[PDB]
DNA sequence: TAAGTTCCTATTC
DNA sequence: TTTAAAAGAATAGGAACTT
DNA sequence: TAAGTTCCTATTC
DNA sequence: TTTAAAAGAATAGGAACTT
DNA sequence: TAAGTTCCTATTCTTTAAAAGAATAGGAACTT
DNA sequence: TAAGTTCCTATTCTTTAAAAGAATAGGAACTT
């Protein structure tokens, strides 16, 4: 894609190209500059700091609606996220003098304004009232939760297809992450992490985030018909490793566990599967659903205070001098967080407590066994993940 | 009117004929411009962004009287609630070109004047307001005997039934949730639930989105003890008015979601106010522009302070400081003003009264026996709209008593 | 005083003055303008509104100090708090065009600056410290509360000195108020209001305080060597009516409690018999020491929450819209703060009560004899104070 | 020093040096200007407000490596943390008309550059250092048992007893109070007061004015469960070192008040970090420029994220939030070790080791007729609060 | 010996 | 690290007279 | 009959 | 009445191809 | 007398805005 | 088939600046 592309091409070389483009002026060439524009408009505005790709991706996109031309009067100007216009004008005709450039502040013209809404004229709360209206009635949260699930089990066109939805969809919910914290989890940092209430349970590490806080990822066996480590185990026996995209212009992590594009088919199954009304509704949460979900979760199970920590959300409660330069550790996700959600346990609001339930299989027992063939079920993250992890959940699954 | 015109204009349509009012340059044309040239005003400032009602009103009635013009030198100017005049200037013109336009400030002192103005008062309505209002709380009267001596001002007055009942549930209502009329108004009736309440057993909640700081807020009913009861308006109220098509009130044409009614008629406040006015069972009520539907708001804030609850003030009266945000009223809050129970000061808890009837428990009995669907009986008006959960529950209490 | 003599010219007259001063230039005619130029500069920043007395006073002293003039180049400055100079300097020139004026602001050039400091080079914390000993150490508050009561007792040279002292002194304590508040209050307001704790307290009102929020002050029966009541008594039957002073260029209210003065009168005298050290502190409290004990015994009990309601300190729970237009009833004092300051009660942190003490006599079973003659023992205020309070204490006083 | 130096010198007096310096235009005079030159500059964009040692001192060293000039044409300019240039430059001129000054703002990009610089590196700070405090509490030991190797890294190493004692005294309460060392050096030492905690009887308190942000804040001493006791090393520091002079640290020179005497030396801090340095009991410790007396307040900061208590850090590490705040009871509890927090109550939950803190401190309490505090501490004696003094001089020995 | 200081300069919060 | 300055309205004090 | 309405304008939050 | 605007970095969607 | 007053001046508190937006209150001629 | 992909564009999150001040860390030449 063009950003692939501009992350291949050297910078003087980007630079070349952008003058070429005014030397012939042709509507041609600077009807394109669009890309390079954007490169350099970055490249000035936070001095040689690389671009970040859906950075370049939605200025580029800025850029290329606005950008317009005289090439009489040598008079360019376009749209940018910036509010220092002059200073990036300046630096701008120092590398083509003979022209005049205005860069206008993103944050119109009337017969477009008009003609816009004359156009509406003809034709997000929504789906927060849909989303209450779902939670608000006959079912809970888990019930929701498998529902979603098996909603893909039919649908799917291939194997491969619905092993990937369902384990996203259930990944993204225990970890109240977004798609990108589950899709960029480094699979070669799999490990097994002791929590008092279930034995062990699968860590991974994510650090591509969206604010860049790193963050873990779990996998945990589950009471019940939904257990995560199964559709650990469907995912690793159907997808394969996926080499790390570049996502920055610059100049270490081979491999990312989910395809970006999973994203798109995702959405567009959730779409239409529409196992509810919410999923109807343009631009209401699809991949975010999982999110949501457990937020709503802990809220109405009464734990909100693990709400940040769990999905990941700058804490506040302490200086962000406090946090940005004094805190040298990956906040964790307390013990009992997983207790919960493994459903081996429940939440006592007044006894402050977790209690758990008579099940039959201990979870902690049942681990002891286990830990009392990884490499030959899980051949495709051979080598990639820890064969420490690859023989847990191997013996987990056969074990069951 | 004039709003609901706009909203049933295509853009196109508007800026057609603003347009078409300067071809050939005449005083009748030109002088009506208004409407539409606040409309344009508007798009243009806020990019196509709706204009609510009011504001268009208040807007439009600004350019109105301000509007000016020259046909002869082709100059237009009118005031607008701005201060970057020169950029709608601009805007304005390129869909006029042949014409010049002047933006000038709705907001923007000689000695002199201020002297001899002081001069006149050395020698010998709104301050006037604010004193009666005090005097009002200071005298006597507590806030509740008030209440009620406000609300019967209406019982012999009215000139139909219907209209006692608004009134005096309009009152009651403001007055409770310390809402504006437009509070109670634009409530969607279709939102009705019986909420739980550990002091009350349980009260009537609705929802109103359409507020004036766009915060949506919750509207109670409750039983209440003494000669006062929100149930028992609640119950007259639903028994001689009807549900209300929810009125368009934003230029968009968002036809999806936006509830399809609303509790009262817009228009329910004039009625209302003028009554007041007349019957001023008040002193405060004769001032003119001093507070009419709003007095409920004035005197709950006030029995807050008196009360030494302020705390609880910004939430009831909803003052600013993935669920659809919204924010309730304490439980307490409720316990207090149905007068079932008694604020303690120091402790900090509210205190029932000894009174044999214990509002909880008459609860139970009402929900007891269920499955006399008589509330559709009661209530056909708003049969099929309120919840009949709730139709009952009122209905019985009614009965029950 | 100034003050007064500027509320009784007439605006026209005023302006008038203010003009001739500059038609036959003499230094005389120019340096006197400060009072006037006060009230202009006033009138014109405010439109019209009218000016307080106090804010006259500083306004008018800031000027007359920093006046300055040249009456050859037809030039005059002056000091005044403001910001937007020009506008002012405009609005004085339009009424003497053949002058030029330069507002300086209150709230530089090197040589100033470095004098300044080569004077500094040879040359409040200090109260803050000695409040807290004084407070931190051996004697309670209402034991130094006595101990300054008693100072004035012999110290005194008049026995209406002595009266109003102690009176002020002890009135300012229970209601944690000004001075003003005491002294401002409107004789005329005097009520018998119930008090489930002590049976009625006597209950005043003021309105022309500081923060201009109307507040009430009290007078109730204590247990112990300190009683208001008495102090109550002394005080009016020693001291007369006072003609409210005007105190706004200008609202209704005939008299006052206290006279304007007596603060001086009582402040000196509290520096000399200083009963301790703090009173020695030059511009340390002075009748302000009345509130700051309160202040303090109050938190000290552990009952901050009455505080701000006590003292009367602007509310900041409820928005301003709300304070301001909406509210329009004073909060009201809580009934158990008068039980704790009467010391026929004490309060419990833990059982969250009021504790009355097993003394003899029931504060509200004295108040029911005394309920089931005053005109002649306090003439004075007789026709101005209630008579039904004017019974009340009559009765009480005998009473015992 | 040279600041110190300037606090002694009369305001006219510096004008006038500063001026006879342009009178013979020389190298050797204009070039010593600076600190000179920077007091002017301050006292003009502030008017008079006196100017703090670090603030001079940094400003100082700005100018100096930026002052440049022409003797022939009049010429001098140097570089200040300022924005309104013009202004500060007008007045140094009215002070010497013969003269053009130029300020050049301190804080300021020509894309070619940007962009070669960029093409180069398309071809092939902290950041070191913040992997390094990344690794440190990402591998092994716990924090307690990290503090624990650092404090022993100075019992073998110092050359001295005092040292030895300084050097561990410091950093624990660094770490205790997760404070900055000036935290700890600019202590009131005759501010020490037994204060009572709910969790551990009493425990000690003293008091920091002239802080950082210059926002005052308690510093605590506290016994502790466990090989690491902060009231011991409180012992040893009090045992070795004595009260400090209160130095002067800005040009106010009012006469009042401020406090006679600070607890540790300023200059402890130099050997100290430089000690760290060497005996670096971790990676971090050698990288330069990375923390070093610091550490202990970044150990607490993490501290009390990673135990789920972030809610103390603003209050505890005293940064901006919304009579000077002071520290809720359980977070002593907590850091005493004899208590341990629960996540899911929220509570502190003594552990069942026999030793409960409260019982102690009454028995402690209870004996009196024991001033022998002042003679367990003489140093001190007369400066730290005697009732304090006799609390460590008993804790001590009953233990 | 250096670890300690002393007194600026360089870095960081 | 951090981030509300100041208008406007009291309460002390100075000092020359009064009782 | 005048209280209630209709639809702007004037005021206030 | 209200009073954090917006840069920067995700997650939906559109639509023409692939299987 | 020197405490008690006058009447300014010097210090020290308390509380804060402006204006685009969006309601509520009033004016008049109509409606029932 | 259309579900599943590509590769942009359109929407919706998430957190916060810039720089004057004010400490802490390091450089060099001395010192106990």
Redesign the interface.
Known sequence: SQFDILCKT???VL?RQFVERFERPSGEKIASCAAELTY?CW??TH??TAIKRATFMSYNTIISNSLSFDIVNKSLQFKYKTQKAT?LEA?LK??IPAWEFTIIPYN????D??????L??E?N?????M??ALLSEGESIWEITEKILNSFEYTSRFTKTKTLYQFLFLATFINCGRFSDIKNVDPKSFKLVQNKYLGVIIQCLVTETKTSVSRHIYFFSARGRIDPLVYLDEFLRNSEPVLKRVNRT??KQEYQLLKDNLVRSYNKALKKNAPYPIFAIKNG?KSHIGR?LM??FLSMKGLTELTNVVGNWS?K???A???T?????I??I???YFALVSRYYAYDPIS???IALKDETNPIEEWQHIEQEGSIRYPAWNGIISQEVLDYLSSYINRR
Chains 1, 3 share one sequence.
Not at 325 to 329: M, S
């Open positions: 050297p910078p003087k630079v350099l490249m000035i001095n040689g200073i630096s120092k590398l119109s013209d009337i017969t304004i008009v003609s816009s809404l004359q509406q004229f034709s709360s929504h789906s927060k009232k989303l209450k610059g100049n949460p949501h937020t709503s804490d409660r302490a200086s001098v406090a946090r330069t004094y805190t040298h550790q906040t964790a307390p013990d009992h402050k407590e977790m």
